[PDB]
From Swiss-Prot, chain A:
Natural source organism: Homo sapiens (Human)
UniProt effect for mutating K48E: Loss of interaction with NOXA1
Family: Belongs to the 14-3-3 family.
InterPro entries, A to Z: 14-3-3 (IPR000308), 14-3-3_CS (IPR023409), 14-3-3_dom_sf (IPR036815), 14-3-3_domain (IPR023410)
Name the record gives this protein: 14-3-3 protein zeta/delta
GO biological process, one term: synaptic target recognition
Modified residues (N6-acetyllysine): K2, K67
Curated annotation (Swiss-Prot), chain B:
Post-translational modification note: Phosphorylation at Ser-10 induces the interaction with YWHAZ and inactivates kinase activity. Dephosphorylation of Ser-10 by the SHOC2-MRAS-PP1c (SMP) complex consisting of SHOC2, GTP-bound M-Ras/MRAS and the catalytic subunit of protein phosphatase 1 (PPP1CA, PPP1CB or PPP1CC); this relieves inactivation and stimulates kinase activity. This modification leads to destabilization of the protein, possibly through proteasomal degradation.
Protein's name according to its UniProt entry: RAF proto-oncogene serine/threonine-protein kinase
Gene name tied to this protein: RAF1
Function: Serine/threonine-protein kinase that acts as a regulatory link between the membrane-associated Ras GTPases and the MAPK/ERK cascade, and this critical regulatory link functions as a switch determining cell fate decisions including proliferation, differentiation, apoptosis, survival and oncogenic transformation. RAF1 activation initiates a mitogen-activated protein kinase (MAPK) cascade that comprises a sequential phosphorylation of the dual-specific MAPK kinases (MAP2K1/MEK1 and MAP2K2/MEK2) and the extracellular signal-regulated kinases (MAPK3/ERK1 and MAPK1/ERK2).
Residue list for modification Phosphoserine: S10
Species of the source: Homo sapiens (Human)
Disease: Noonan syndrome 5: A form of Noonan syndrome, a disease characterized by short stature, facial dysmorphic features such as hypertelorism, a downward eyeslant and low-set posteriorly rotated ears, and a high incidence of congenital heart defects and hypertrophic cardiomyopathy. Other features can include a short neck with webbing or redundancy of skin, deafness, motor delay, variable intellectual deficits, multiple skeletal defects, cryptorchidism, and bleeding diathesis. LEOPARD syndrome 2: A disorder characterized by lentigines, electrocardiographic conduction abnormalities, ocular hypertelorism, pulmonic stenosis, abnormalities of genitalia, retardation of growth, and sensorineural deafness.
Family (UniProt): Belongs to the protein kinase superfamily. TKL Ser/Thr protein kinase family. RAF subfamily.
């Protein structure tokens, strides 16, 4: 059973059918056993794609609503609301998986940081469309606990620790409107990883996140 | 913008 | 209301929500008025995107299905589920063409455009048909293209992008579905040469380049 659902999720991924992929990995998670690295990466990939499509459509429609008659504005508004409901339902589904299964079963610091980052991300997507104060604080609290754990248990070049710093820096910039704290957090993460330059299997992923941290710093300084 | 963590041809759309 | 359905379809398009876009254009069509050129292109774009997603997925999974026992059956079943979606999309489009678009089309340009679309959607059914229901599907695609082909040769200039795109797709039908590369090459080269002889020009020269790219691929 669990095996078959994982193989169906992989098939759906190759077919670029991410809603199918996410439904497979949701069912795996609901079986209540701690996920392997491979399973949690499938779950993360599936939902990031599913929510990413809705966030992209929301930005396009939200903006059309803001640049607009009255009949046309209202159409855009109602369509924005429809996409928002899809996006909210997806975030709530992931956050429910995180509360009920993933975070309670996480037996290692690496996975606890992984899931607390995910929780930070999905409240941050809720914050993008938000009630907003409470959502923002839930995001900030998940990131902050992830951040403390990763600093205590992970090397500064660990891709999960770097990816957490990238996303928490984006949260400070874009959600909290605290650009100086965003730049401070991103520059420290980049500089500490440069100082300790890593195993074979992580070269590519750590350094790719380093490039994104520096690209954000370039953008936010220029 | 800012970043967070990541055979024959037929007629195309106009 | 037509006009507001059309606005919704443009917004769906902007949001890259092509299933929403197609549902809006299906509703416009089912109001029974002849579509404007803008509406016709919206309908075509929406469904070409919606069916294109399933054809792309089908090709991936089908490929895995063949290149592999419990795992072969799982791929087979998934391929079947994608095929059902694809077949339902094509059937939807083909009903709209039969019931509303082809009978109401009052200009040769429209009539050719929709008969080509009918050839196309039976061709996508032919790509996934197996067993006994294939020869009849292939024949329906051929007959639709042939009708479109005779009207376009009579009524349209050889450089008209609709006439050129019909030659492109009909030639693909002969190569990929009828396994008749000589007929495919001859149809594509004639369409190219006839447009050269009598030389929307951006769309026209783009499709001429595609005609000659297929000739190169099929010769090579």
């Amino acid at each position: 059973d669990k095996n078959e659902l994982v193989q169906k999720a992989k098939l759906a991924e190759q077919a670029e059918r991410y809603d199918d992929m996410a439904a497979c990995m949701k069912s795996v998670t609901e079986q209540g056993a701690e996920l392997s690295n491979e399973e949690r990466n499938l779950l993360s990939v599936a939902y990031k794609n599913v929510v990413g499509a809705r966030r992209s459509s929301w930005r396009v429609v939200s903006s059309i609503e803001q640049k607009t008659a009255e009949k046309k504005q209202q159409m855009a508004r109602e369509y924005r609301e429809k996409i928002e409901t899809e996006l909210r339902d997806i975030c709530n589904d992931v956050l429910s998986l995180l509360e009920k299964f993933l975070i309670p079963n996480a037996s290692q610091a690496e996975s606890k940081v992984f899931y607390l980052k995910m929780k930070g991300d999905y409240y941050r997507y809720l914050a993008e469309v938000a009630d907003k104060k409470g959502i923002v604080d839930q995001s900030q609290q998940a990131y902050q606990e992830a951040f403390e754990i990763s600093k205590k248990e992970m090397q500064p070049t660990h891709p999960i620790r770097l990816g957490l710093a990238l996303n928490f820096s984006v949260f400070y910039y874009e959600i909290l409107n605290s650009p100086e704290k965003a730049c401070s957090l991103a520059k420290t993460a980049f500089d500490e990883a440069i100082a300790e330059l890593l195993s074979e299997e992580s070269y590519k992923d750590s350094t790719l996140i380093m490039q994104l941290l520096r690209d954000n710093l370039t953008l936010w300084t220029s | 913008h800012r970043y967070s963590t990541p055979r024959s041809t037929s007629t195309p759309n106009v």
